[PDB]
Design a protein around this motif. Structure first.
Motif, PDB file in Angstrom:
ATOM      1  N   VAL B  22     -42.764  25.138 109.855  1.00 43.04           N
ATOM      2  CA  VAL B  22     -42.342  24.030 109.009  1.00 43.04           C
ATOM      3  C   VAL B  22     -40.904  24.278 108.528  1.00 43.04           C
ATOM      4  CG1 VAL B  22     -43.719  25.193 107.234  1.00 43.04           C
ATOM      5  CG2 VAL B  22     -42.713  22.945 106.739  1.00 43.04           C
ATOM      6  N   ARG B  28     -43.846  24.376 100.034  1.00 44.27           N
ATOM      7  CA  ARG B  28     -45.132  24.837 100.552  1.00 44.27           C
ATOM      8  C   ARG B  28     -46.125  25.073  99.415  1.00 44.27           C
ATOM      9  NH1 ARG B  28     -41.073  26.616 103.291  1.00 44.27           N
ATOM     10  NH2 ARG B  28     -41.041  26.417 105.568  1.00 44.27           N
ATOM     11  N   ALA B  32     -49.766  28.800 101.962  1.00 46.04           N
ATOM     12  CA  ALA B  32     -49.045  28.558 103.229  1.00 46.04           C
ATOM     13  C   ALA B  32     -48.528  29.793 103.960  1.00 46.04           C
ATOM     14  CB  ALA B  32     -47.897  27.563 103.033  1.00 46.04           C
ATOM     15  N   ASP B  33     -48.044  30.779 103.214  1.00 48.24           N
ATOM     16  CA  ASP B  33     -47.361  31.914 103.845  1.00 48.24           C
ATOM     17  C   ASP B  33     -48.186  33.185 103.735  1.00 48.24           C
ATOM     18  OD1 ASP B  33     -44.644  30.375 104.164  1.00 48.24           O
ATOM     19  OD2 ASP B  33     -45.130  30.256 102.012  1.00 48.24           O
ATOM     20  N   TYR B 110     -45.480  18.952 103.403  1.00 49.28           N
ATOM     21  CA  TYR B 110     -46.215  20.023 104.095  1.00 49.28           C
ATOM     22  C   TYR B 110     -47.562  19.491 104.610  1.00 49.28           C
ATOM     23  CZ  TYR B 110     -48.347  24.522 105.193  1.00 49.28           C
ATOM     24  OH  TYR B 110     -48.989  25.561 105.846  1.00 49.28           O
ATOM     25  N   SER B 112     -51.059  19.820 104.804  1.00 53.80           N
ATOM     26  CA  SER B 112     -52.066  20.556 104.019  1.00 53.80           C
ATOM     27  C   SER B 112     -53.047  21.456 104.791  1.00 53.80           C
ATOM     28  CB  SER B 112     -52.840  19.602 103.088  1.00 53.80           C
ATOM     29  OG  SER B 112     -51.956  18.858 102.252  1.00 53.80           O
ATOM     30  N   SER B 122     -52.174  21.705 111.966  1.00 58.60           N
ATOM     31  CA  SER B 122     -51.604  20.894 110.876  1.00 58.60           C
ATOM     32  C   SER B 122     -52.481  19.671 110.568  1.00 58.60           C
ATOM     33  CB  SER B 122     -50.184  20.428 111.245  1.00 58.60           C
ATOM     34  OG  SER B 122     -49.279  21.517 111.389  1.00 58.60           O
TER      35      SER B 122
END
Ligand SMILES: [Zn+2]
Ligand SMILES: [Zn+2]
Ligand SMILES: [Zn+2]
Ligand SMILES: [Zn+2]
Lengths: 328, 329
Positions: B22, B28, B32-33, B110, B112, B122
Motif C-alpha cells: 500500500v 494504516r 497492518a504492519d 487502506y 481493511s 485486500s
C-alpha cells in the motif's frame, strides 16, 4: 463476517506475547521470513510420492552429511531441547515461560525452532494443556496442579527438521489422566509396532485404535502423522484411526512421524478463534506422544527416543509410586 | 501434527499471489504492519459496552464521526462497483483483488481485510459453496458461478463494510433463488432495526424469510459493530434465538444463506469457510446506523437496485416468488 465460538471445556486462552527473535547466524527454513509463513517448497511438494532416503550410512554415525544422518542429528538435538522443557514444567509456570526455554535452548544449539511462523504460527513451540488436542499456543496461563501438558518440539538444522512430542503430568495426576496419558503412549508404541518394510500405512491406525479402545479412549481423526525431513510436513500421511483410507506400502528409507492424539471422550475436535488451538468437542482431556522414525532394512529406527528409553511421564509415576492402568 | 481436510464440494483453492503493498502516504490501521495482524484496539475493546455515536450531524453532509463512517462506506460502494463491473467468466479473483486494491489506494484508503489477523488479501472473494472469507486466487471465474465480493475500507480512523453476491455468466434456477433469498434476508433483517428493538429479533426475521426460499442460515458467522474498529459489538446473529438497539449504534447485518445444511467447515488456509454439504451459499451486507426514528444504510447501491437484479433484468430472468405454520381442512 465476524466469527463466533463457544468453548467446550474449562480451559481459556491467556495473553499471547510477541514471538521471540532468532539470532542472525542461524539458517532459516523458507517460510521463516514470509508474511503469512507459507512454505513455497511444501506447496510445490504436496501430492508427490513418498521420498526414499538413502540408508547406506544409517548405521555409520560418522557420516554426518548424509541426509538421513542430518535428520538423526536434528532429532537428537531436539530431544535435548524437549527434556529441558519438560524438566522446567511445574505448577505455577506459564506455557509462555516454556516457550522462552525451548526457544533459547534451540537457538543455543544453532537451530531454528520449526513452528515459528510456520503458516503464521506465532510462537516457537506448541504447548497443549488438558482438552487441547494439539497446536496450543504458549500463553500467560499458569500451569495448575493436576494438569497434563504436551510439549511438541521441532527444529531445523542444516536443511532438515526433527520432530517429537510428549505429555507429562503437572503435579500429582488423577486416575483418568493417568489412564489417558499411558493410553496415549501405549498407542504410539502400538503404531510403531506395525512399522517394518512392506507393512501398509493403513495398518498403523488399525493398531492404534485397537490399543486406545483397551483403555476406553478414542482416536483423533483430523490430525495425523507426517513425513518429515527437508520439509516439516510432507508425505506420507499417517492416519492414527482404524479402517482409514491411507494408501501405500512402507519401504526402507521412508521417514515419518507417528503421533497419536487420544481422547477420554469422543474423537471430535474444534478449533479456537486463534485458528490453531484444537480442543476436544466434548471438553474432555486429550494426550499425545510423537517420534520421528525411518523404516530400515529390517524394521524401524526411532531418532527421538528418550536417553534411556523410558518416557518422562513413567519416571514421574515411578517417583510418585502411582501404578500404570491395566488394559481391558 | 498434520491437519487433514475433505473438500465438501467441487471448488478447490488456486495459487495465491504474493502480498500487495500500500502506497507510503496512506494511513494504516494498527494491525497492518504487525506480524500476525493482531489489532491491539480490538483486543482492548473486547467485552466493553456498545459505542453510541453522535447523530446530530447525520444528515449534515457538511458537518464528524458519523460522516467519516458515511464517507468510507460511500467510497467503499464505489470500489465494490468497480470490482463487480470487472467480474466476468475467465477473470481470476486475484485479478479482482488487484482491481479492489488499486481502486482503494486510488481513493487514499487502506483495504481493511489486508493482514487483518493475517488475512493475505485486500478483499474477500467467495465463490459458490464458499460461505465467506474466500481468498483471491489463481482460479478463473467460470460460467454459472456466483461471486460475493466483501469490501471493507479504512479511512480517517473509520471502517466501512459491505458486500454483495453477483452472477458470473447466466445463472441456473438454484443460484437464482439463493442469491435472491440472501438479499431478501438482508432486507428482512434491516426491517427490524429501530430504537428500543432487541438485537435478537434480527435473526428471527432473517430465518423466517430464509425458510420461504428453502434455505438455511449460517450460525457460526455474524454481523458486527464497525467504526473505529473493524469488528466490535454488537454481535448480530442471523438465526432465530443479548442487547437492545439505541440511536447511534453502528453495525452490519450480513446474512449468509445456504441451499443445503446450515453447517460450515473451514479450509486448510484457515480462512475460507464452505458449507458442510458442499451446496451453494450467498450473502449480502450493509453497514447501518440506528437513527432517531429507525435505520439508515450507508452502503446502498447508487440507485438502490442490487447489481444482481440489474444483471437478471438485462438477461430477462424471472424473480422466484416466496412460498408458504397453519392449515385448515
Ligand atoms: Zn461485516
Ligand atoms: Zn511434532
Ligand atoms: Zn509431527
Ligand atoms: Zn464485510
Amino acid at each position: 463476517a465476524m466469527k463466533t465460538f463457544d468453548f467446550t471445556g474449562p480451559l481459556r486462552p491467556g495473553k499471547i506475547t510477541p514471538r521471540r527473535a532468532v539470532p542472525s547466524h542461524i539458517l532459516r527454513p523458507d517460510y521463516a521470513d514470509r508474511a503469512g509463513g507459507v512454505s513455497a517448497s511444501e506447496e510445490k511438494d504436496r501430492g508427490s510420492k513418498v521420498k526414499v532416503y538413502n540408508i547406506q550410512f544409517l548405521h555409520d554415525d560418522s557420516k554426518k552429511t548424509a541426509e538421513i544422518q542430518r535428520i538423526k542429528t536434528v532429532c537428537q538435538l531436539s530431544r535435548e531441547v524437549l527434556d529441558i522443557a519438560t524438566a522446567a514444567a511445574k505448577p505455577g509456570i506459564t506455557t509462555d515461560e516454556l516457550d522462552r526455554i525451548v526457544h533459547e535452548a534451540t537457538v543455543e544449539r544453532n537451530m531454528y525452532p520449526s513452528p515459528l511462523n510456520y503458516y503464521g504460527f506465532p510462537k516457537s513451540v506448541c504447548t497443549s494443556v488438558n482438552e487441547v488436542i494439539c497446536h496450543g499456543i504458549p500463553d500467560s496461563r499458569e500451569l495448575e496442579e493436576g494438569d497434563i501438558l504436551n510439549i511438541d518440539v521441532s527444529s531445523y538444522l542444516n536443511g532438515f527438521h526433527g520432530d517429537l512430542n510428549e505429555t507429562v503430568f503437572i503435579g500429582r495426576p488423577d486416575d483418568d489422566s493417568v489412564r489417558l496419558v499411558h493410553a496415549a503412549y501405549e498407542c504410539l508404541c502400538a503404531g510403531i509396532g506395525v512399522v517394518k518394510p512392506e507393512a501398509l500405512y493403513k495398518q498403523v491406525g488399525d493398531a492404534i485404535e485397537a490399543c486406545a479402545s483397551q483403555y476406553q479412549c478414542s482416536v483423533v481423526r483430523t490430525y495425523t502423522g507426517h513425513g518429515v525431513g527437508h520439509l516439516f510436513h510432507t508425505s506420507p500421511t499417517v492416519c492414527h484411526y482404524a479402517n482409514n483410507k491411507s494408501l501405500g506400502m512402507m519401504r526402507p528409507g521412508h521417514v515419518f512421524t507417528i503421533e497419536p492424539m487420544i481422547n477420554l471422550g469422543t474423537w471430535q475436535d474444534v478449533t479456537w478463534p486463534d485458528k490453531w488451538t484444537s480442543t476436544t468437542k466434548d471438553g474432555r482431556r486429550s494426550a499425545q506422544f510423537e517420534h520421528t522414525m525411518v523404516v530400515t532394512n529390517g524394521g524401524v529406527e526411532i531418532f527421538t527416543d528418550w536417553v534411556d528409553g523410558v518416557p518422562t511421564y513413567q519416571k514421574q509415576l515411578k517417583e510418585w509410586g502411582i501404578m500404570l492402568p491395566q488394559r481391558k
